């Protein structure tokens, strides 16, 4: 009954950021030390919460959200940020309590000639609300003429591939990101630290 953090952090394939994965962690012992004692992460930022104090607390659910972005977008996975990722792909709330964890995945997610399998949303009629997930492929109406699902002048496909080549500069290399969210409901608290 160890919490299955391995299934998120060590997944062979990650989600595109527009279609970010969420894992519900429940009814298990959360060994947070496996994460905070690791040398495997370059980003490990916890807002209004300490992963060492999490060991002493119980939650109804913990959520692990995971996806790939490029290195210079990791800064957008934070409260109060703007840019294509925070605006159109994955939005944290201003009052976020939880952890943002990231690591360079150039060895897994780049290939010679380009890995194009990871996409981002480039166009949207409004910014995402916090933890909103938009997987629509509706043609984006950039002007006054309705598209009727046909691409052309002012009528664009709303997604685009990252081009991940192993020789990309570090700012253009793929990073795997996991966001931990903590939830208390009117229900049993089933996710507890080892204490």
């Amino acid at each position: 009954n160890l919490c299955p953090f391995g299934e998120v952090f060590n997944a062979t394939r990650f989600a595109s950021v527009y279609a970010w994965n969420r894992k519900r962690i429940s009814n298990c012992v959360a060994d947070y030390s496996v994460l905070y004692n690791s040398a495997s992460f370059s980003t490990f930022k916890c807002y209004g919460v300490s992963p060492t104090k999490l060991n002493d607390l119980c939650f109804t659910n913990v959520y692990a959200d995971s996806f790939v972005i490029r290195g210079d977008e990791v800064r957008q996975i934070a409260p109060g940020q703007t840019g294509k990722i925070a605006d159109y792909n994955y939005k944290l709330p201003d009052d976020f309590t939880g952890c943002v964890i990231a690591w360079n995945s150039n060895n897994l997610d780049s290939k010679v000639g380009g890995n194009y399998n990871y996409l981002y949303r480039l166009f949207r009629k409004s910014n995402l609300k916090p933890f909103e997930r938009d997987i629509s492929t509706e043609i984006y109406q950039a002007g006054s003429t309705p598209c009727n699902g046909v691409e052309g002048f002012n009528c664009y496909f709303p997604l685009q591939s990252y081009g991940f080549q192993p020789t990309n500069g570090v700012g253009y290399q793929p990073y795997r990101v996991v966001v931990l969210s903590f939830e208390l409901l009117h229900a049993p608290a089933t996710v507890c630290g080892p204490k």
């Epitope: 380009g114 194009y116 399998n117 664009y156 709303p158």
Partner: nanobody, 127 residues
Framework: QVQLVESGGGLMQAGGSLRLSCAVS????????MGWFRQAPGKEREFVAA????????YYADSVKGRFTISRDKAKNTVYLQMNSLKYEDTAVYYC????????????????????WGQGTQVTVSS
Amino acid sequence: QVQLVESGGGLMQAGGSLRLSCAVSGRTFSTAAMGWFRQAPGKEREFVAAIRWSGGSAYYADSVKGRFTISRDKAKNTVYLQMNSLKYEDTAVYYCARTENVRSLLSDYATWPYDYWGQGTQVTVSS
């Protein structure tokens, strides 16, 4: 390995219509677009048409607009080129091409590189 296999080429009288097929096997999920190109002997290969795999919007070279139609059957992993009103000038080897690069602007598929290519099928338009 991803394989592209064209079929349907042959001898046609001018003014007739012919459908080419290109069947794709191996990886499926990753396909962004499929294109048709053609090359006459001693001439440079040229873009004919592209189709976005999701959604199915098509982009055409000016020299085949109103005449050729590109279409695809996702379930059969196959792209088609319906070549109406055949001209002597359409005589060439027709090549299908596949890209996994999702581009927001459909017109990118007229000039961006394709990483997978078929062996080509010969179309000859007589009289």
